[PDB]
């Protein structure tokens, strides 16, 4: 049947400033079927307090979810989003770029 | 345009060996979600997801809860029947999705109604714009079509779409007006990042806007750069607003030939932006 | 408010 691989964006709610609290978002979209596992990572380690939006879908029937957590960025901490889905032969990791 | 929509989005997913199919419904007014229901919740109930719906009394939540519980049961029967219509085994997982609701104009009158379905991510059956007839995707959906003609389903769907859907949408708009009828314009800026001695990226940002519909384009000497623009999907910020960016790689020294054009409902007029090196 | 379900597929 139809399988569609997730698009993945990782970004902050507000423009980042080191030492100012913010939210880190991982937006997964365009995928089918709906089963998907998403972790947010700080220096490689899973962040525990992560919530997500209620499952919904686009006009083309593909799913989307926003996963998010509060965070305080700094110059040297690296953040990322790690996604697994039946379309991926291994989990995909997308690094947060403060300018994307 | 002053128009608005209400939509309910249902997802039913079978999971053989792991219980009955999960049912999730979410409801939206335009780009704002306002309710959910999830059959896997501890005590499944319609729940508020925007502030302006919280005022509705207990009869609202109770009645809607009973409706979703009925809908889950109907979807589970649908899933069983779809498996048979496609000669599928009982071992695999399948998905039934439903979209329905109404669009109204500034005066509150019905513009269009919608009631349609997908199975395993593929369009299955849809109520036509006339709200009287169906379009079936294949010979399996023709069985559904025959059943739903014989039961006069379209008449009932029309009555909901013309009556309840419109009437409740108008109420939601009037109770949530401060947000639902407020367009927040994008905050915009252009950034510049050299990629090599000979090229730089110009990125045109739009932040903080509502509703999600926006157009961001780059022009070079006033010609649209459709093929050479990297455009990200419009994305939620998590505070009701959306974000988007459009980027072009340009020859160093030619930045001033590029303009970023921004259209959004919240703007008095469309914006033309350039990179201004400070 | 959501619509009362009518008939399965």
Numbering used by the authors:
A (entry chain B): 0 to 99
B (entry chain A): 0 to 277
C (entry chain C): 1 to 9
Task: Quote the study that presented this structure, word for word.
Cognate T-cell receptors (TCRs) expressed on CD8+ T-cells detect pathogen-derived peptides presented by HLAI molecules on the surface of infected cells. In this study we focus on two HIV-1-specific epitopes and their presentation by 4 different members of the HLA-B7 superfamily, HLA-B*07:02, HLA-B*42:01, HLA-B*42:02 and HLA-B*81:01.
To better understand the mechanisms underlying the observed differential HIV-1 selection pressure imposed on HIV-1 by distinct HLAI molecules within the B7 superfamily, we focused on two epitopes, TL9-p24 and RM9-Nef, that dominate the HIV-1-specific CD8 T-cell response in the Southern African HIV-1 epidemic. To explore this notion, we first solved the atomic structures of HLA-B*07:02, HLA-B*42:01 and HLA-B*81:01 with TL9-p24. Pro2 and Met9 acted as primary anchor residues and Arg1, Val4 and Arg7 pointed away from the groove for potential TCR interactions. Leu6 was in an identical position within HLA-B*42:01 and HLA-B*42:02, but moved by 3 Å in HLA-B*81:01 and 1.5 Å in HLA-B*07:02. HLA-B*42:02 has a unique polymorphism within the B-pocket and contains His at residue 9 as opposed to Tyr9 in HLA-B*07:02, HLA-B*42:01 and HLA-B*81:01 molecules. This polymorphism reduces the interactions between residue Pro2 in the peptide and HLA-B*42:02 compared to the other HLAIs.
